[PDB]
Symmetry: C3
Amino acid sequence: QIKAGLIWMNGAFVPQEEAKTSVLSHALHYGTSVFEGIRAYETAKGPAIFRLKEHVKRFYNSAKVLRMEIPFAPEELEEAIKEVVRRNGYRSCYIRPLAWMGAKALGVNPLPNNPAEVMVAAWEWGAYLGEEAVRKGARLITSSWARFPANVMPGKAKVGGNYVNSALAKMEAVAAGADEALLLDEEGYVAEGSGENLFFVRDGVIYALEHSVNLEGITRDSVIRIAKDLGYEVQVVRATRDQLYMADEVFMTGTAAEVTPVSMIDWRPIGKGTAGPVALRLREVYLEAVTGRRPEYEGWLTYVN
Amino acid sequence: QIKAGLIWMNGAFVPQEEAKTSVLSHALHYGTSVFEGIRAYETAKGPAIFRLKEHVKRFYNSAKVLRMEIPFAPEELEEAIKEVVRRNGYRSCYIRPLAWMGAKALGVNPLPNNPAEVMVAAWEWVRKGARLITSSWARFPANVMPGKAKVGGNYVNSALAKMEAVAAGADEALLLDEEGYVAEGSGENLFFVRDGVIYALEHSVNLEGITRDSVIRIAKDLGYEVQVVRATRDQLYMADEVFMTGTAAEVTPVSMIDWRPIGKGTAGPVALRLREVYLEAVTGRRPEYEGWLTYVN
Amino acid sequence: QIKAGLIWMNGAFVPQEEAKTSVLSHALHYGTSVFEGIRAYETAKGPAIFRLKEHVKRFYNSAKVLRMEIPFAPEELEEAIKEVVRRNGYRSCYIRPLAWMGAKALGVNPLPNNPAEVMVAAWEWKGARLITSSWARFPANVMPGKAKVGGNYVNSALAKMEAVAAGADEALLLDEEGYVAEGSGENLFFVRDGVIYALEHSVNLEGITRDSVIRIAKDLGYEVQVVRATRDQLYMADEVFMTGTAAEVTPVSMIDWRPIGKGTAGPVALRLREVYLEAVTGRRPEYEGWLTYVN
Ligand SMILES: *Cc1c(COP(=O)(O)O)cnc(C)c1O
Ligand SMILES: *Cc1c(COP(=O)(O)O)cnc(C)c1O
Ligand SMILES: *Cc1c(COP(=O)(O)O)cnc(C)c1O
Ligand SMILES: [Cl-]
Ligand SMILES: [Cl-]
Ligand SMILES: [Cl-]
């Protein structure tokens, strides 16, 4: 499977083969888990975790939505997140904290299963997209699956069950020949990708999409701050698929996707048909920030060493 | 059970006992009435009615939505509201102006019943925070009921929600709109605070609160950044603070929603400061906000 | 019929009489066409087309929504538009560019019909009373509301007919959720306590007149906010007005038989309208950039 190595399991690191849970775990049956996507980027000062506290804060916030009790102080989880990097001797890596309801009972109500089991795993990237691919840009296709209304699934939380919607949309997009899916909300407005927030640029202005039913991305937040620091005007608005069709540029953000320009949506080219200068510039500054080359953004980094 | 005393009835004051209307009144059958909630607070210079002008304007605006004709000039209603306070010797009181379609006919169309009958009555009138529960009743879409007006019929929705919330052990209900976003309480506008920024909910299908308006101005004067946004229930769950505003509720901190504590689980500093400046304003202790007060004496 | 005169038909001008297309044209059966509305106003320096490039850009943008191919460069279309005014001797006129899918086939899919055929035609050019329509403007995933696609106007046509039959001048469409959207072909604004409120784009077309009015309003010193609005927010507004190439800035004095403010055209709407007219007729140096002098 995934080459994670030593995994933190409820308080102590164990070999990957020991990082297993009962197949009767509530979360494996009812999607009652919460997770985070965190990255450590190598610097000449060792690995630096990007916006660790903001991600951990969201982790506990997601748990609160499910009334899930995480039996560890945020400080303990933060230490575990730094340790999973050190103990495995990783430089750059992806970190996946997970809290899930165990196998105490299988009634749909997860309360009797509290407190939640928790683990932190991390693994290295197999490959990265090169500048050629980034410039060609991602191709999106609008999904036939709508992102869930705000009173159907908790869209501000990274709750496991939520991703059945993301999985269905992603599979559909790939089957259609696209790189990613663009989900609309039930009313017909653009929501977000299967796991990425959307932005578009028109006549010099950068438009971030309102939160609506989307997750409040930390990369999105980072990109907006960076854009403003560079002197760009940033507006937050609700958008339709055809506002994106006629945008000068479109790009998406996410911990895994960083800043990814989108060159085509529903087989309709965006602007020049390749990544545009704004998205390529934002991506560069963002990468400079996460890899510790921007003193003004060092506050966002937590050095493991 | 209400100790209203002298009530202004279509032009003249009469004892509470005499303030009655036909049970064939259109409004008692079809909810065709409009009302307001106005408060008078005691100050060093006597009772002061808070934002009288704004409330009366909305009273007439609500009537317009129903194509209801109020047979009095706003100035006359304003005098009656001041008199209801004076004549009853009130200082701190709740004032309830009410215009309703009468008993001329009972066809559902209220036009034949114009002009409306009008009456004005009044009666003498935290850190733990209020507990809310999200309702199973959604606030009406903007093309179903006039959500910007205080129309009587609208409150069947509020009544159902409030009843459900209290039965569930909460202090107030939090209504969502039909699309699933947060709307407002049964009779209060909502706000939340996150990372130092105050978020006032967009008007959407909610009533444009005068207390909400007041709080925003106060917040800005204090130096807080205020953003007007649409919000989901979980954005509130993760807020540092959340509070409600309304004439009766003033500025009320909300410490818990759906049994999920908000922030520290007790009233937060921001909501408390806004409430304090608001109470200072309505009691005549803020010169910069004196324009909002109408002194009875 | 319309007194268009010489019409540009896929590259060359021909008498109106010859400006015809097969009744088997895809667009005549399935609404697969795109168009624009552009005006030329007389100025001291001759006819001037208002914001020509922005309109042409939207024309091509509308085509992209339908994956329609326009076999001419924007520059060529812009020249044709200027020429339709010159050749016909027009001073103040309405210009109607149109790109439509032809008669190559009649399967609903329009791709086999590309490239589109194109034509450019032109003709010399109290407060409105509105009634809220029983037809909702289409959701953003039902019809492309940011594009001037022919088929979209069946919705506008139905709303307009209803409004007129009800005794009003124009229709006010709500979106499916119940919020105000726009008129059959005009963007909406309202004024309350000195502030001008432009409606968010939601499912509406991004009007060029709306854009011009917002800039003018800001330049005059007005505070402008962009919001979502309900019908009763309009009922209680001090003023309500709508914008569009044909409607310019039109004040709205009544909605659903409920008077707006004074019940007559208000000062803000009337002023924006007058300043807009001054801009399009070349009397405001600050807005000269928006004009294209034909001569
Ligand atoms: C994780 C996630 C994102 C991206 O948020 P980041 O904090 O930028 O990683 C966006 N949308 C969804 C649905 C997500 O789960
Ligand atoms: C009266 C009312 C409010 C609060 O408005 P205030 O002007 O602040 O008193 C909020 N929501 C509803 C539904 C109301 O009826
Ligand atoms: C053309 C149109 C408008 C007006 O836009 P302008 O660019 O100002 O002419 C508004 N709504 C619709 C549906 C339209 O087709
Ligand atoms: Cl397609
Ligand atoms: Cl619960
Ligand atoms: Cl009516």
